[PDB]
Amino acid sequence: DGIHNDHIKFLLRDLYDGKEENVPVIEYFGGRILKATDEEPDIDGLTASRDANKISYRLSNAPSANLPDVDSFMQL
């Protein structure tokens, strides 16, 4: 703890000038998230709609073998 806290202190004082208000805050300490200057789904076999109440994703019922990564589909 000691070693880490000297680090966060050293680090605050050296890049936040004491102001812990400057230290950004997240819900839980998890993995960084990817920013898209797009924000629009350029994804095949997937359609994307939304209101103020609901976001709709649905995948083409066409038998064609074009669908999103199981990975991508969950990042979304």
Write phi, then psi, for 6 (nearest 5 degrees): -60, -35
Chain centroid to Cα 29, Å, comes to 12
- Which method was it determined by? X-ray
CB-side neighbour CA atoms (13 Å) of 57 = 14
- Residue the block writes with tokens 């990975």: 71
Strands (E), the chain: 46-50, 55-59
Resolution (A): 3.1
CA proximity to 46, closest of 30, 62, 67, 72? 67
Q: Is the C-alpha dihedral spanning 10, 11, 15, 17 positive or negative?
A: negative
Contact 12, 4 (CB under 8 A): no
For residue 11, how far is the Cα from the chain centroid? 25
Which residues, 6 or more positions from 2, have their beta carbon under 8 angstroms from its beta carbon?
none
